[PDB]
Amino acid sequence: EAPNQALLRILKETEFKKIKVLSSGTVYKGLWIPEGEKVKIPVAIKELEATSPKANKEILDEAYVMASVDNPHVCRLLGICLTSTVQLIMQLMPFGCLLDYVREHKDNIGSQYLLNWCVQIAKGMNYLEDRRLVHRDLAARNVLVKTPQHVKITDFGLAKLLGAEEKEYHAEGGKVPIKWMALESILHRIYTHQSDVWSYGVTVWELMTFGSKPYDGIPASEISSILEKGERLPQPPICTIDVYMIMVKCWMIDADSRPKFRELIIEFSKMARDPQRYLVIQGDDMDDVVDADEYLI
Amino acid sequence: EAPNQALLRILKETEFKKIKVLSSGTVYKGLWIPEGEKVKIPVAIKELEATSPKANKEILDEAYVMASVDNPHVCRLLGICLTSTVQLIMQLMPFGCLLDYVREHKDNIGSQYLLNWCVQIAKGMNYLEDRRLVHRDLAARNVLVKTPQHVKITDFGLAKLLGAEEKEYHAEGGKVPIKWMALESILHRIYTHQSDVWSYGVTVWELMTFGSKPYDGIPASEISSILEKGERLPQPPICTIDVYMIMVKCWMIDADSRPKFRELIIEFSKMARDPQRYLVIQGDDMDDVVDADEYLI
Numbered sequence: 200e201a202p203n204q205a206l207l208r209i210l211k212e213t214e215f216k217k218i219k220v221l222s223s224g225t226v227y228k229g230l231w232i233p234e235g236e237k238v239k240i241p242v243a244i245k246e247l248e249a250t251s252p253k254a255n256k257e258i259l260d261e262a263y264v265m266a267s268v269d270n271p272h273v274c275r276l277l278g279i280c281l282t283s284t285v286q287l288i289m290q291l292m293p294f295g296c297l298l299d300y301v302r303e304h305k306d307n308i309g310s311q312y313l314l315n316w317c318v319q320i321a322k323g324m325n326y327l328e329d330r331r332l333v334h335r336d337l338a339a340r341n342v343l344v345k346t347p348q349h350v351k352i353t354d355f356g357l358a359k360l361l362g363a364e365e366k367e368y369h370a371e372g373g374k375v376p377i378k379w380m381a382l383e384s385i386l387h388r389i390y391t392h393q394s395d396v397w398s399y400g401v402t403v404w405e406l407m408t409f410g411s412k413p414y415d416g417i418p419a420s421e422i423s424s425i426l427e428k429g430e431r432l433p434q435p436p437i438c439t440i441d442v443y444m445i446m447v448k449c450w451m452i453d454a455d456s457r458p459k460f461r462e463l464i465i466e467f468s469k470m471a472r473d474p475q476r477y478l479v480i481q482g483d484d485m486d487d488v489v490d491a492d493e494y495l496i
Numbered sequence: 497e498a499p500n501q502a503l504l505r506i507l508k509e510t511e512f513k514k515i516k517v518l519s520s521g522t523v524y525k526g527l528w529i530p531e532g533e534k535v536k537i538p539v540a541i542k543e544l545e546a547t548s549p550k551a552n553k554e555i556l557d558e559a560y561v562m563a564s565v566d567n568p569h570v571c572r573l574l575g576i577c578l579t580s581t582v583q584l585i586m587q588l589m590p591f592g593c594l595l596d597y598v599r600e601h602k603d604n605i606g607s608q609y610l611l612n613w614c615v616q617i618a619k620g621m622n623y624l625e626d627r628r629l630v631h632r633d634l635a636a637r638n639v640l641v642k643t644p645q646h647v648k649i650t651d652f653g654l655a656k657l658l659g660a661e662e663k664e665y666h667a668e669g670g671k672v673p674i675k676w677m678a679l680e681s682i683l684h685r686i687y688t689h690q691s692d693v694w695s696y697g698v699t700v701w702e703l704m705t706f707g708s709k710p711y712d713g714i715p716a717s718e719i720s721s722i723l724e725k726g727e728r729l730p731q732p733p734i735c736t737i738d739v740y741m742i743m744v745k746c747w748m749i750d751a752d753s754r755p756k757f758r759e760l761i762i763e764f765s766k767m768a769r770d771p772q773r774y775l776v777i778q779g780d781d782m783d784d785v786v787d788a789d790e791y792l793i
């Protein structure tokens with residue numbers, strides 16, 4: 200119901216430079232140098248290839264959602280460039296997605312890091328709930344790493360802002376990641392902040408298992424059935440009953456019985472105060488470079 | 497021009513407990529335990545004594561401003577309690593005001609800390625500028641320490657929100673700290689975000705001198721004259737010309753020539769990247785406790 204006065208910055212092609220590829224849709228690492236600004240901002244540039252009115256339609260919708268959010272735990276969209284193919288310019292997250300990061304650094308990841316990430320993600324998600332936004336694609340692959348102590352939620356490709364009175368969202372078609380979906384979503388294509396909570400649970404499970412694939416080797420087709428019998432992801436070896444209990448609660452069939460993001464922040468913060476009691480792990484020129492987080496135009 | 501939909505929480509006397517005195521106006525350290533919430537939030541309680549309709553008028557105005565701000569670098573007001581004397585309930589800042597903190601720890605304060613504080617304060621101030629709010633009392637004594645790596649701006653007792661079209665604020669009477677005021681303020685009682693910048697400068701100078709008193713031993717009466725001749729605070733021994741130049745620019749007579757908070761964030765962030773190049777310093781049961789920063793009701 201309130202007016203979205205967010206600003207959409209249009210960037211000049213000549214203002215930034217692509218330094219190297221980060222993926223191939225294609226994403227580049229590069230630098231944005233606002234003319235006459237005297238700063239160099241590290242960025243990720245997502246361009247996309249053979250122009251399709253359908254594909255341009257999608258990225259503009261993602262740009263719209265990203266331009267409308269502003270929280271320390273949500274990815275910052277710097278602007279867009281209107282070249283043949285529209286490119287999204289974001290803040291560079293040096294360490295990549297969190298799923299790959301826990302896989303690559305298992306042996307160096309302590310309980311303090313795991314719990315802090317859980318807290319940060321819950322803060323980002325609580326913020327989106329406040330903005331009446333439903334992510335619909337929360338997963339460890341969609342959380343990025345600015346620094347090991349600072350992650351942010353990303354990928355607003357499925358995100359849906361809700362209407363003033365719209366309590367839930369009814370999708371129609373389209374492939375949504377099945378292993379991260381609430382049961383009400385799979386069966387009735389219904390999405391809510393509470394279904395994001397369910398995905399929060401899987402995401403935490405992915406982290407606690409250091410990057411394991413949920414329901415590994417189980418046809419997505421069967422998933423709906425497995426969850427109906429009452430089966431759920433198993434307790435990660437490093438998890439105390441306290442942590443697993445939280446995950447399980449995010450997987451309750453009754454959406455309203457699952458925890459609220461604001462509560463997940465409180466619980467995980469408490470545990471983050473004494474990490475070892477909750478997770479048991481063995482061994483526990485760039486002169487003018489300025490991070491986008493410090494560049495407020 | 498936009499509606500301030502901030503929420504004002506009214507707290508029950510029985511919900512929190514005063515643990516000890518922090519000052520004597522009187523401020524106590526204590527714990528807030530929202531009934532049936534299962535959390536304990538460390539807080540500062542400011543009560544004030546012999547009820548005066550004039551004094552209650554003032555604190556409610558401070559409560560109003562504090563309830564309307566929400567930024568990581570601005571003090572969080574949890575709520576108020578309507579007892580004989582109205583008490584403001586804030587987040588406890590364990591380490592006290594920054595002025596006393598730099599005085600007490602001179603020998604342990606490195607360049608990295610100094611510059612990071614400068615950045616944080618500029619972020620808090622930039623945020624207030626966005627909220628069209630003029631602090632009017634920025635000083636090292638009015639910046640609090642949550643942790644040595646995290647400070648927040650406080651004391652909204654003089655703060656003034658501006659009208660949709662009100663470009664500046666014309667005070668009438670009242671004692672405002674002279675040694676931290678812009679020249680246009682002292683001479684014409686005019687205040688703006690740009691006059692807050694001037695006070696930002698003095699604040700940075702207080703930090704760089706580890707808590708020295710500005711214009712020490714100089715009758716406040718004379719100040720207006722000194723500043724007119726062109727005199728300003730001296731270059732702190734640890735400051736490179738780069739840092740001092742910034743301070744001096746905040747003390748330009750032409751308000752519009754002084755830097756903007758958004759710029760101060762950029763400059764100090766750059767310096768914070770290689771602290772030693774800019775400041776030269778020799779040697780460079782509480783189970784359910786939850787910080788207010790993690791308690792979002």
Ligand SMILES: Nc1ncnc2c1ncn2[C@@H]1O[C@H](COP(=O)(O)OP(=O)(O)NP(=O)(O)O)[C@@H](O)[C@H]1O
Binds near residue numbers: 221226291293354
């Ligand atoms: N801001 C960023 N900084 C650094 N890396 C990023 C950033 N955004 C995305 N990436 C990475 O770029 C690659 C593609 O990201 P993305 O646009 O989410 O597509 P995807 O979900 O990874 N795969 P797909 O959906 O098939 O295109 C992945 O390695 C992302 O983690």
Ligand SMILES: Nc1ncnc2c1ncn2[C@@H]1O[C@H](COP(=O)(O)OP(=O)(O)NP(=O)(O)O)[C@@H](O)[C@H]1O
Binds near residue numbers: 589
């Ligand atoms: N949230 C807080 N946490 C911890 N200490 C605080 C907090 N708020 C204020 N204080 C301290 O309580 C004392 C009084 O603060 P304050 O209400 O700003 O009055 P003051 O400016 O210090 N002196 P005065 O204006 O004469 O009452 C000082 O030590 C403050 O630093």
